[PDB]
Amino acid sequence: QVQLVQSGAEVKKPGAPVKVSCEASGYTFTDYFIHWVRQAPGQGLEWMGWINPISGGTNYHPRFHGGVTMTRDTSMKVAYMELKRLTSDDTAVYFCARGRDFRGGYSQLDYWGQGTLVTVSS
Amino acid sequence: SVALAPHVGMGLDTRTQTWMSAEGAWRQVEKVETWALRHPGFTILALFLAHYIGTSLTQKVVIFILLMLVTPSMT
Amino acid sequence: SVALAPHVGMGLDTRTQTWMSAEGAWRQVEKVETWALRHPGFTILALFLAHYIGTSLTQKVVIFILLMLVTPSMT
Amino acid sequence: SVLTQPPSASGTPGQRVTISCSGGSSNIAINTVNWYQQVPGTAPKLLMYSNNQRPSGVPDRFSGSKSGTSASLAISGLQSEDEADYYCATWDDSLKDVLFGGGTKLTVL
Amino acid sequence: VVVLGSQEGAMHTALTGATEIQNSGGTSIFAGHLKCRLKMDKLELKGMS
Amino acid sequence: VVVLGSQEGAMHTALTGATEIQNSGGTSIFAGHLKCRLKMDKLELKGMS
Ligand SMILES: *[C@@H]1O[C@H](CO)[C@@H](O[C@@H]2O[C@H](CO)[C@@H](O[C@@H]3O[C@H](CO)[C@@H](O)[C@H](O)[C@@H]3O)[C@H](O)[C@H]2NC(C)=O)[C@H](O)[C@H]1NC(C)=O
Fold first, then answer.
1. Is the pair D, C in contact (3+ CB pairs within 8 Å)?
2. A85-117 burial, b for 16+ CB within 10 Å, e for fewer?
3. Which range is the signal sequence, renumbered to this chain (chains E, F) (predicted)?
4. Which of F9, F19, F33 sits opposite B18 (nearest CB)?
5. Ligand 1: which residue has its CA nearest to atom 31?
């Protein structure tokens, strides 16, 4: 079957970069999208950016260009997102989802993982 | 690219087929021909220009062919 | 493909500018210019042809300019 | 523009309640809307993988479409197990990003 | 067999000489042109008195 | 300001004289020629006797 492990939740301190790994096996990873939607506690979830594993670059939400970075590897079929700067704002669980490349399918987030959770405090 | 300067005639060819030969063979020619059939107005002016420029049928023919070929390809 | 044959001269005149007036005003001349800078070889051939076909000065210069325009565009 | 959907309440007797999604002339009026319902605290699942096409969601009772600038969802025979937050997400083509909504707190009595 | 991608920018390049018509509700064609006649008989000067 | 769409099809139309290779991990570039000066020094026929 096709699924995303999303590793395990970790929490850190402000001013340091944190990493969220996200592996999806069971299908040809090249053709489909990875969306990295954030979800805050008791708030709506907003999507930030795609990553095409085969040739894609970061296409963040306008709120988040220069705030996050996205990388990937084709051999292991895993997509990496890391937070270059942790303020007090980003206290939420970050997700993964498979997306299609269809114009009507840019929002097609069919499959989701568990959700790696990160919060920041002193 | 802007698809206005195809990577053609570079000389580094091999026995194997190119990316697209069956269509790039006649793409530009068909553009010129559909232009010409759509708009015949330029033909009268081209005929006049070739005719009143110093006329030896070699010169007239080459001027007419070039002038009728350049405007469509390079609009 | 469809990138060829824009309707630049289609004649549906309007007061406001078009979709891309700024680029489209000079893109074709830009293509010719970059083609010439890339490839200087065709200049010698065009000069030779004009010199050995052009009976007069004006015929020679017209032949040269038409040849130097058609080939980069037909590329 | 940006989409905003309202939170509302309902009851466990079967009744048609409409989760209306409102957008603009560039984000949802031309593109396929996508409907999500999330069981709270876990990963949301996908409810409608096209404009009016459901992949495997509860059939014959979850159906909706869109009209002009508005998209809507209709649920019938809603019981308690359907307690979920419902999300409408549309792809914005002007800003080259998908436009997720704030969220509906659909509570069923 | 291949797919030859998408012609989005191809079409955007093609429509060089066309105008722009912003359509939000139906269509709102700007960049228009129209001839008119002004029958100006019934124009009070408003300041005679 | 507009972003002018996607130039993918324009590119696929542009490379009208380019050759092809295969991209699978490493790239095996086909479509090339190589001269080789054969050396027939030690070849001997089986079953001559
Ligand atoms: C490019 O434009 C986007 C919007 O189109 C700008 O996003 C804005 O980012 C700031 C901070 O990243 C947001 O402020 C935040 O607002 C929330 C609202 O609840 C508040 O709780 C936070 O404390 C924070 O102040 C702002 O809302 C957001 N604008 C939106 C979402 O419309 C982005 O900053 C721009 N990039 C630039 C100018 O480089």
1. no
2. ebeeebebbbbbbbbbeeebbbbbbbbbbbbbb
3. none
4. F19
5. A63
